[PDB]
Amino acid sequence: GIDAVYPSLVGTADSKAEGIKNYFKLSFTLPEEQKSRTVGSEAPLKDVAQALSSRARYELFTEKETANPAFNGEVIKRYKELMEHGEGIADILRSRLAKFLNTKDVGKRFAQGTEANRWVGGKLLNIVEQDGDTFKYNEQLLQTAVLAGLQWRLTATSNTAIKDAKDVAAITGIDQALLPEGLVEQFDTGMTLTEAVSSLAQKIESYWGLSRNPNAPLGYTKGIPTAMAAEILAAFVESTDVVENIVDMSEIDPDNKKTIGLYTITELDSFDPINSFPTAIEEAVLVNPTEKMFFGDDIPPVANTQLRNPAVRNTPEQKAALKAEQATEFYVHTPMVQFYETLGKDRILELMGAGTLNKELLNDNHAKSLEGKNRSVEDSYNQLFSVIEQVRAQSEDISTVPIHYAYNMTRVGRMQMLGKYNPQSAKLVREAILPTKATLDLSNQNNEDFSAFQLGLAQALDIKVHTMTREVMSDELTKLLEGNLKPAIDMMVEFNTTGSLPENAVDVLNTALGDRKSFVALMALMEYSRYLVAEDKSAFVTPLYVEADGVTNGPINAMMLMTGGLFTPDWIRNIAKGGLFIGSPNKTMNEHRSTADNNDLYQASTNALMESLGKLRSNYASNMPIQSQIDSLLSLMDLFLPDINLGENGALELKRGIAKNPLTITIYGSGARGIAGKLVSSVTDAIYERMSDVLKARAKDPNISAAMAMFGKQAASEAHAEELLARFLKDMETLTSTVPVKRKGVLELQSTGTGAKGKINPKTYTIKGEQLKALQENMLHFFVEPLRNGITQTVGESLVYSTEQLQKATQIQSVVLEDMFKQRVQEKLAEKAKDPTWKKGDFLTQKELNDIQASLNNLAPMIETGSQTFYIAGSENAEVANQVLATNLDDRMRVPMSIYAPAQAGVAGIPFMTIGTGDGMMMQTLSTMKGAPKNTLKIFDGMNIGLNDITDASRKANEAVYTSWQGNPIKNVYESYAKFMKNVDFSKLSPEALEAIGKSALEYDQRENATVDDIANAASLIERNLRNIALGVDIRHKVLDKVNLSIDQMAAVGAPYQNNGKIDLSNMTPEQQADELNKLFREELEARKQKVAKVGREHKASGVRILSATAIRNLAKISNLPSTQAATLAEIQKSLAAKDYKIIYGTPTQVAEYARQKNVTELTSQEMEEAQAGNIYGWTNFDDKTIYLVSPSMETLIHELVHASTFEEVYSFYQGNEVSPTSKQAIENLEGLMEQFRSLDISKDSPEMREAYADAIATIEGHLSNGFVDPAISKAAALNEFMAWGLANRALAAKQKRTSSLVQMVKDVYQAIKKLIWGRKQAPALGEDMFSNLLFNSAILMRSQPTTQAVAKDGTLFHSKAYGNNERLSQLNQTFDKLVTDYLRTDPVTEVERRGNVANALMSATRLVRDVQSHGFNMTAQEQSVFQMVTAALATEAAIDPHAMARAQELYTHVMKHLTVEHFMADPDSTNPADRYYAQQKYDTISGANLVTSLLPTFLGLAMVNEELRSIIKEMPVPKADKKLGNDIDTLLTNAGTQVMESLNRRMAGDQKATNVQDSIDALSETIMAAALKRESFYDAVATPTGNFIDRANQYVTDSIERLSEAHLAKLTAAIASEKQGEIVAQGVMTAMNQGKVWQPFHDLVNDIVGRTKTNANVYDLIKLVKSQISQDRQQFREHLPTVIAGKFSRKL
């Protein structure tokens, strides 16, 4: 033991004594085995100096036969100098020891007997050796530590993996996803004080080779090395090896003030020989090294615990996936590493970054953000070539050395490589080290291997492969290769045969690639250039890959795991965007995006945002200053942030899987204030970047203006840029000098100082302080709140409910666990305080902490799912200890005490379950499934696949998605919450803890004066809610497994997976599929419930009975109601019988079956919670005047007659009709009460009354804040819901209640309805029963016309080969919507004659659009719609402002001087007279001869859409007057077009009613409506893969025949169309069919049709057979035959 080894330690070694004590030999034991080779060496420094003398000596020390060949002669010399450097710092520590022995007579006091070794900063004196008068370190304990410090210096940051997200939020107070760019990347440079010394203290303990004492105070087993590690950290920062930095984000944050210090270690020279082998000392002193690179057969072990979660043990299923990943082998790519080193590190930075950087040509705020951008690349560049240098030393061929990596399980159940820079995280290393390989036959360009080769190249160059067919993708790829990228490819071809690059290589690549610049784009060019120069193209070996990426993986996974209740048609359509197709076998994502829908979930959320903003803006028609504030915010965003779809799509940033999109951030529970800060930070970054362009433009020409140097590329003239500058300055001052505030449901503007003034000064421009705060306040109220409503509309309101309950349960559980852990360490400190041995400054033992942690097991802290384990509250906090661990000898650096204890989870509950169970289980299954794909790199939600296994590995990836979607996150969380309620005691919590749980369990009004019994009642109510959500999810997954599905979530190739369901759901509309799925949902509910327990005509096909008008007249007597109100029904009966009201009633099954047969949408109200109660309600169809009842009684039938009649008066009043004067006052009186209804205080009411009020408000406000529904319909619905609430709560409020404000409201509304029902005649006295407890329970159905913005925005992103797939037109159509379509009035359009002035311009412009296409300019359906819409926008503006087309006249006249007929002829010297005729036809239209005034707007519109005309125009010379701008004629024409529309945008955004332009806009909206519906008809008419009119028609008829009806010869015809002989196809097709015998199967079918041969088949069976043969011949002869002919050429013609 330690008594035997170095027994010359100072002090007494006894456990207890009265004299001085040495606690080192007590807190540390002696392991029996060997861990450090210097345990028995007095002088370890000379033990390694002799070890590193030569290769022969190095072999014997480590006890192995062979060493790493990289230990060559050069690195021996470099280690000798570094070893001497460690000796230089060894003597430095001696000097500080001598100073301590005499300064402040500490040694003299130590000589007296004072226990200074037990102090905060004296723990280092437990090891100091005795020399009598003087004292000194034990030499062995000192030398072994320096080697730990030296090895730490080289690999301090290399081994530091990616920091966890939870830790970053803890040290900042803001979620890492909402942090601005640059600061997040700054973590690689700086590490906090605790992190710097804890890492160094880990090495020191390991190098000593000792064992901790489990029964010793934590202030000695952990504080002794930490105190000495800080000493070694000193004299290292003294040599400037580490720098000191202070954070600024929290410093500049208007609210946060938590300053954080950072520590960054300086790098080393990239050419250092020591960089070729930096792990010589580590692998010599140690026995089993942990810092290693695995070559050949070296396989890493499997970790037994999670990452930074020692309490969680890896499950046996998890350990199988970790083993599989580390078995994959990697090889370097030789061509890339040779290309990288020729460019150099500096040229790489210029290409990838923003060019060369200098303080003169950069904004102050913009320049500092590039430091973190450039820091990552240089570190990654150095790391890659350090690894390669080690590989090259082991073999002559560097491309044949296998390399293995390490993996571990993170806190959310993902797999992450160990190391900061690796192929998983860094993208520079990704293209040099790959595990994929393939062999292809490229001798023919029509092969199938060439098609897969093209897919890899197209995806690398930023082409959306997962949205187009494989034929369309090849068309666009070839254009780039022979077009813009041609100069770059030619340069690359020269490099492959010369090894040299042009001087201006960086400039060439920037012009070629453009905005597609990425490290994978250079890979595509290298492989293509290698292909051209190869001679034998039949055995090409390439590492090119294609990644299978998920389509909105985040939101889609959450939508399938935390959704309950019945199915809805909205859910079916929205889930299709993720790749879940119902009733469509063998369907792929490419087919869906080409014929069904091209809008993803990210775009759908944005569309709903603009509808909510329009509704909010419309409510302030009487408050002009508020409206102008909204327009300023929108105008500023368009100038700098065209699209808000943020993400991890950068170029020089590491990949961590963090979600930074506004849609995903909101769902994960981020705060509203936090979101607004992130959006503001993006806008200001774009402003700062523009300030770095004016500085550069000034250098080239110091005479230009500020407007020219900023908005030059977007200006059509000199004066246009002046308008843009003035608009930008006006908007900026308004936002930063005014703030919106909320005053009882309305917004009021207030002044808070002054904003930015008139001075740019691009070098020193900054927005900060009070101006920054006013920016975020404007965005929070005007942008974030409308954004939340739009998200709830897409993902559904059922998922939002489940997220709130999950967050509340996880927050409450973590707060309790945090309080009891702190309450039990305070007891042990008090118990140990009386112990004489214990002394303040120590802490608990390791065993005591273990028992306290094990004492909370009855509260169920961990969640188990059967394959994964989660510990949300786990963290390495420091607030629990609230002490000081140790400090430096100069009392400068103080290290606090950190323990592994539970911590508050905040709002981390939601992202934990979505990622761990949705994506983690998906990607863990893929590794361990039967037949898993091999040789793939998987990052977090993608998987790189070699080109030889794409079609099969992409199908097993989709299969793993299906298995992942069978989990239940809510059920697993509930199982732990139920046990937590079983062993908790709320009366033993701290006063602050009870306050924290109150904020989650209770509302605002009931928060103050909260009783403990009130906290427990609400806390136990959440447990009931989770039980109902879990039950609903379980039934949903069981039902979905019984139908046929096709899953294409993770795919970019077109290989889906089938679930082999047996119930057919095809040939149905989305509303029909919901009815079928809801039937099975209720069937499963009935079976479980029974398990525990063990007058009118009738329809023929169902038990439903029908009651018509004039059939319930006698029912007045049957009810035997009082005679005073009996006469009322006699009047109600007459009214409803006048408009043909019929009543349908039956059992729930009978009434549901009737709807399916008659195609009726039902609105029955019942839930699983209501199923236990057992009450069903019907619905009313106001469109056709039909009432549907479920199991009616005498009371309910009477209640509905007086309810339907009442709603008719409400509908008529709000439709602009006239009503009785008595009814008009009653509705008006009710309307006024509703205004005060939503402003009451319910804090003094009964708990059961609060729930009723809460439900009413949520549904009422939804109708009022709805923008896509007709306001007349929405207004009536809101009032109808108000009456139902009052009648429902009359009984329970009239008794056992006080006279509260809400109670009086119930009594008033009841009387208000009484006057409305009875009219002007006398009503029954107050307090009398209405109709034996009258109630309103049936729902209403209402429909109306959709708005213009609804249909125009639907077809914006349509694209297809038969429809048109021009990308430039879609982007042009997007900017049109922002300027024109968004500002149209929300009311639905009408049809009036509209005689006026602008209406003449639109009629004239419509005729010219058609006339242009009939006189030489053919257009597709996509080009036609954009041509019509844009021209009508310029036509109405020119009819209001006569000088709008002044600039376009100058450009039109200049073009006419350099135009000739020969410009329109492909062959200038053709002989066919028809070729010249068509060219002359196009010339006349441009000259205006054919068109024969609104002629100018048509030309301006045509010059933007047509692609053939723009090619001719761009080659014309530029006038000398416009040479200053520096733009071609085509861009000058497109910039003039937006100027006209921008002027019109201001016209519609002002006071339309007073300007007398309201009628003119109503004419423009009609034209947009007409053109939107026309492109909705051409689309869906080509909705087939072939895009043919006939093919689509045949498919519709076939599916309509299978609905009513409720093989061999197909192979022979395939052989006829696949003949490759040449001598056989020359004999005709009659001979082949006669020789092919195919005439016999045809005879059998026709013989049945004619009747010669008898058969038992019906008509529908034979019709399905004849129509199946026709489609077979069309498929083979029109599609497959042309491919055979084209396959005989070795080229693409």
PDB file of all heavy atoms in Angstrom, residues 1453-1460 1463 1512 1516-1517:
ATOM      1  N   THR A1453     -36.164  52.629 -76.831  1.00  0.00           N
ATOM      2  CA  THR A1453     -35.661  53.268 -78.044  1.00  0.00           C
ATOM      3  C   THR A1453     -34.231  52.838 -78.348  1.00  0.00           C
ATOM      4  O   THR A1453     -33.855  52.695 -79.517  1.00  0.00           O
ATOM      5  CB  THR A1453     -35.744  54.788 -77.913  1.00  0.00           C
ATOM      6  OG1 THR A1453     -35.064  55.205 -76.722  1.00  0.00           O
ATOM      7  CG2 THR A1453     -37.195  55.239 -77.849  1.00  0.00           C
ATOM      8  N   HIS A1454     -33.417  52.634 -77.310  1.00  0.00           N
ATOM      9  CA  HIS A1454     -32.037  52.211 -77.522  1.00  0.00           C
ATOM     10  C   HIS A1454     -31.969  50.806 -78.107  1.00  0.00           C
ATOM     11  O   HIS A1454     -31.108  50.517 -78.944  1.00  0.00           O
ATOM     12  CB  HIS A1454     -31.262  52.282 -76.208  1.00  0.00           C
ATOM     13  CG  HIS A1454     -29.886  51.699 -76.287  1.00  0.00           C
ATOM     14  ND1 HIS A1454     -28.832  52.358 -76.882  1.00  0.00           N
ATOM     15  CD2 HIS A1454     -29.391  50.518 -75.846  1.00  0.00           C
ATOM     16  CE1 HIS A1454     -27.747  51.608 -76.804  1.00  0.00           C
ATOM     17  NE2 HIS A1454     -28.060  50.487 -76.180  1.00  0.00           N
ATOM     18  N   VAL A1455     -32.867  49.918 -77.674  1.00  0.00           N
ATOM     19  CA  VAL A1455     -32.859  48.545 -78.167  1.00  0.00           C
ATOM     20  C   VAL A1455     -33.217  48.503 -79.647  1.00  0.00           C
ATOM     21  O   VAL A1455     -32.652  47.716 -80.416  1.00  0.00           O
ATOM     22  CB  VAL A1455     -33.808  47.675 -77.322  1.00  0.00           C
ATOM     23  CG1 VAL A1455     -34.112  46.361 -78.025  1.00  0.00           C
ATOM     24  CG2 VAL A1455     -33.210  47.420 -75.947  1.00  0.00           C
ATOM     25  N   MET A1456     -34.146  49.360 -80.077  1.00  0.00           N
ATOM     26  CA  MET A1456     -34.609  49.349 -81.459  1.00  0.00           C
ATOM     27  C   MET A1456     -33.542  49.778 -82.457  1.00  0.00           C
ATOM     28  O   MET A1456     -33.740  49.587 -83.661  1.00  0.00           O
ATOM     29  CB  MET A1456     -35.835  50.250 -81.609  1.00  0.00           C
ATOM     30  CG  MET A1456     -37.142  49.569 -81.264  1.00  0.00           C
ATOM     31  SD  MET A1456     -37.160  47.864 -81.840  1.00  0.00           S
ATOM     32  CE  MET A1456     -38.089  48.038 -83.357  1.00  0.00           C
ATOM     33  N   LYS A1457     -32.430  50.351 -82.000  1.00  0.00           N
ATOM     34  CA  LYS A1457     -31.381  50.772 -82.918  1.00  0.00           C
ATOM     35  C   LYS A1457     -30.444  49.637 -83.308  1.00  0.00           C
ATOM     36  O   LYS A1457     -29.788  49.727 -84.352  1.00  0.00           O
ATOM     37  CB  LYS A1457     -30.571  51.916 -82.303  1.00  0.00           C
ATOM     38  CG  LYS A1457     -31.087  53.302 -82.654  1.00  0.00           C
ATOM     39  CD  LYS A1457     -30.463  54.369 -81.766  1.00  0.00           C
ATOM     40  CE  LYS A1457     -28.969  54.144 -81.586  1.00  0.00           C
ATOM     41  NZ  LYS A1457     -28.299  55.321 -80.965  1.00  0.00           N
ATOM     42  N   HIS A1458     -30.369  48.576 -82.504  1.00  0.00           N
ATOM     43  CA  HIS A1458     -29.421  47.490 -82.724  1.00  0.00           C
ATOM     44  C   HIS A1458     -30.126  46.148 -82.907  1.00  0.00           C
ATOM     45  O   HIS A1458     -29.576  45.101 -82.562  1.00  0.00           O
ATOM     46  CB  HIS A1458     -28.422  47.411 -81.570  1.00  0.00           C
ATOM     47  CG  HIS A1458     -27.720  48.703 -81.289  1.00  0.00           C
ATOM     48  ND1 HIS A1458     -28.282  49.703 -80.523  1.00  0.00           N
ATOM     49  CD2 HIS A1458     -26.504  49.160 -81.671  1.00  0.00           C
ATOM     50  CE1 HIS A1458     -27.442  50.719 -80.445  1.00  0.00           C
ATOM     51  NE2 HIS A1458     -26.356  50.415 -81.132  1.00  0.00           N
ATOM     52  N   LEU A1459     -31.339  46.162 -83.450  1.00  0.00           N
ATOM     53  CA  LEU A1459     -32.125  44.951 -83.642  1.00  0.00           C
ATOM     54  C   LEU A1459     -32.290  44.661 -85.128  1.00  0.00           C
ATOM     55  O   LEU A1459     -32.539  45.570 -85.925  1.00  0.00           O
ATOM     56  CB  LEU A1459     -33.500  45.074 -82.978  1.00  0.00           C
ATOM     57  CG  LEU A1459     -34.205  43.756 -82.653  1.00  0.00           C
ATOM     58  CD1 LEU A1459     -33.425  42.976 -81.606  1.00  0.00           C
ATOM     59  CD2 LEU A1459     -35.629  44.004 -82.186  1.00  0.00           C
ATOM     60  N   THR A1460     -32.151  43.387 -85.491  1.00  0.00           N
ATOM     61  CA  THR A1460     -32.286  42.949 -86.873  1.00  0.00           C
ATOM     62  C   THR A1460     -33.012  41.611 -86.907  1.00  0.00           C
ATOM     63  O   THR A1460     -33.126  40.915 -85.895  1.00  0.00           O
ATOM     64  CB  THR A1460     -30.925  42.825 -87.571  1.00  0.00           C
ATOM     65  OG1 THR A1460     -29.961  42.293 -86.654  1.00  0.00           O
ATOM     66  CG2 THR A1460     -30.453  44.183 -88.071  1.00  0.00           C
ATOM     67  N   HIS A1463     -31.177  38.262 -85.940  1.00  0.00           N
ATOM     68  CA  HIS A1463     -31.019  37.890 -84.540  1.00  0.00           C
ATOM     69  C   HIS A1463     -31.992  36.798 -84.113  1.00  0.00           C
ATOM     70  O   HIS A1463     -31.749  36.129 -83.105  1.00  0.00           O
ATOM     71  CB  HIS A1463     -31.200  39.117 -83.646  1.00  0.00           C
ATOM     72  CG  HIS A1463     -30.004  40.018 -83.602  1.00  0.00           C
ATOM     73  ND1 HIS A1463     -30.077  41.362 -83.897  1.00  0.00           N
ATOM     74  CD2 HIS A1463     -28.712  39.771 -83.288  1.00  0.00           C
ATOM     75  CE1 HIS A1463     -28.878  41.902 -83.773  1.00  0.00           C
ATOM     76  NE2 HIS A1463     -28.032  40.958 -83.403  1.00  0.00           N
ATOM     77  N   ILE A1512     -30.745  37.909 -76.683  1.00  0.00           N
ATOM     78  CA  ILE A1512     -30.405  38.878 -77.719  1.00  0.00           C
ATOM     79  C   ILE A1512     -30.124  40.245 -77.107  1.00  0.00           C
ATOM     80  O   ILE A1512     -29.175  40.934 -77.501  1.00  0.00           O
ATOM     81  CB  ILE A1512     -31.533  38.947 -78.764  1.00  0.00           C
ATOM     82  CG1 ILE A1512     -31.666  37.609 -79.494  1.00  0.00           C
ATOM     83  CG2 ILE A1512     -31.287  40.076 -79.750  1.00  0.00           C
ATOM     84  CD1 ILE A1512     -33.086  37.271 -79.889  1.00  0.00           C
ATOM     85  N   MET A1516     -26.342  43.661 -76.539  1.00  0.00           N
ATOM     86  CA  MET A1516     -26.303  44.997 -77.109  1.00  0.00           C
ATOM     87  C   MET A1516     -25.365  45.898 -76.304  1.00  0.00           C
ATOM     88  O   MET A1516     -25.188  45.704 -75.098  1.00  0.00           O
ATOM     89  CB  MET A1516     -27.704  45.602 -77.144  1.00  0.00           C
ATOM     90  CG  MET A1516     -28.562  45.095 -78.291  1.00  0.00           C
ATOM     91  SD  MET A1516     -30.324  45.170 -77.928  1.00  0.00           S
ATOM     92  CE  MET A1516     -30.950  43.921 -79.045  1.00  0.00           C
ATOM     93  N   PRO A1517     -24.745  46.884 -76.951  1.00  0.00           N
ATOM     94  CA  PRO A1517     -23.855  47.795 -76.223  1.00  0.00           C
ATOM     95  C   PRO A1517     -24.613  48.659 -75.227  1.00  0.00           C
ATOM     96  O   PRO A1517     -25.788  48.983 -75.412  1.00  0.00           O
ATOM     97  CB  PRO A1517     -23.233  48.648 -77.335  1.00  0.00           C
ATOM     98  CG  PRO A1517     -24.200  48.559 -78.466  1.00  0.00           C
ATOM     99  CD  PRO A1517     -24.774  47.177 -78.393  1.00  0.00           C
TER     100      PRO A1517
END
